[PDB]
Amino acid sequence: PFFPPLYLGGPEITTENCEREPIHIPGSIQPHGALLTADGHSGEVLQMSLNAATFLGQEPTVLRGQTLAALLPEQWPALQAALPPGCPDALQYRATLDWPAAGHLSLTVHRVGELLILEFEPTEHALRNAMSALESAPNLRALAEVATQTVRELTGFDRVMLYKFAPDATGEVIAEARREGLHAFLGHRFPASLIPAQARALYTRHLLRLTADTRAAAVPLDPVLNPQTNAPTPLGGAVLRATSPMHMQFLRNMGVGSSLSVSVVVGGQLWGLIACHHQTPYVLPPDLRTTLEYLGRELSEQVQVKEALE
Numbered sequence: 001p002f003f004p005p006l007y008l009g010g011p012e013i014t015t016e017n018c019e020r021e022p023i024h025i026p027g028s029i030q031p032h033g034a035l036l037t038a039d040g041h042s043g044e045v046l047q048m049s050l051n052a053a054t055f056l057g058q059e060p061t062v063l064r065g066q067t068l069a070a071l072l073p074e075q076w077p078a079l080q081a082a083l084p085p086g087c088p089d090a091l092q093y094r095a096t097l098d099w100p101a102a103g104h105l106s107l108t109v110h111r112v113g114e115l116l117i118l119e120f121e122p123t124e125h126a127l128r129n130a131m132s133a134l135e136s137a138p139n140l141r142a143l144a145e146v147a148t149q150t151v152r153e154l155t156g157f158d159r160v161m162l163y164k165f166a167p168d169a170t171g172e173v174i175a176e177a178r179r180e181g182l183h184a185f186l187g188h189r190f191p192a193s194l195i196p197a198q199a200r201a202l203y204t205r206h207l208l209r210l211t212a213d214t215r216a217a218a219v220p221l222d223p224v225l226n227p228q229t230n231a232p233t234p235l236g237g238a239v240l241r242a243t244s245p246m247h248m249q250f251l252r253n254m255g256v257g258s259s260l261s262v263s264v265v266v267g268g269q270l271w272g273l274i275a276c277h278h279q280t281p282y283v284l285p286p287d288l289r290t291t292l293e294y295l296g297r298e299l300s301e302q303v304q305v306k307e308a309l310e
């Protein structure tokens with residue numbers, strides 16, 4: 001059973017209670033983007049990340065309580081049609097915005113209950129070839145190797161691993177692609193506690209997460225609770241959600257400035273992760289994340305196929 005989050009008087013997490021951290025409701029985001037929440041009927045803006053006004057070039061007083069009809073006149077009708085009440089929470093509306101103050105932005109929206117969650121961040125054949133390369137891989141080891149090399153080629157990440165969960169939830173690096181000079185993790189195994197049970201559960205439902213800068217302080221949502229419910233805003237489906245500080249510290253101690261993983265899901269179970277590191281902070285472009293999501297699904301399919309052959 002989850003502890004209350006920090007903003008509802010819950011404890012700071014320690015190694016005795018890793019599994020009790022409510023990582024899905026941190027009430028805060030990473031500073032490389034901005035987040036709004038809005039009422040799913042009216043489009044009234046209900047919450048904003050503290051950086052949202054500055055990030056979007058709006059007056060703080062003007063942004064709170066404004067409507068999406070007024071803020072996003074060109075997207076609001078399409079957004080409503082795309083995300084009706086009761087639609088799957090995983091369903092997304094995506095648009096590219098020409099925003100003079102911030103530049104070209106990627107807008108990603110999903111619905112949870114009666115709330116729309118809007119994520120804004122900057123945005124800037126390969127997919128076909130990568131997809132084909134995974135399919136054409138001859139066995140599981142080769143598939144793992146191709147997956148890591150292909151993801152590294154697409155992303156530029158310093159390290160890309162295939163991290164496989166054992167039945168006891170320990171993990172092992174079973175393939176990696178790595179920059180010259182980096183220590184090998186191939187064949188190394190790690191305790192189950194380093195990716196705790198609630199993280200593993202979340203990663204079965206929401207298939208990509210990241211920390212763009214492992215030193216960056218989280219930016220709170222204001223108000224922190226959804227005014228509709230007087231309860232935490234669900235952020236499991238928001239890539240911008242703040243990462244657990246316990247994990248951020250783990251990464252800093254490894255010399256990792258930026259981290260990203262994609263779930264590999266086989267028979268509805270979390271089989272492993274495509275796990276990526278960069279030494280320097282690094283925001284993987286939105287279009288590249290979409291490509292990785294496609295490759296995660298392809299790898300998942302191919303792991304099942306390869307495991308059936310062998």
Ligand SMILES: *C/C=C1/C(=C/c2[nH]c(/C=C3[NH+]=C(/C=C4\NC(=O)C(C=C)=C4C)C(C)=C\3CCC(=O)O)c(CCC(=O)O)c2C)NC(=O)[C@H]1C
Binds near residue numbers: 194243
């Ligand atoms: C006492 C609790 C601790 C803890 C909790 C924790 N860890 C995560 C997320 C991840 N941990 C990962 C572990 C590894 N990455 C590696 O590269 C290696 C070894 C080579 C390991 C063992 C990974 C891959 C994740 C996924 C996230 C990512 O890809 O960056 C969470 C949940 C984080 C979040 O989503 O907010 C939590 C709560 N970690 C510990 O080390 C102990 C101290």
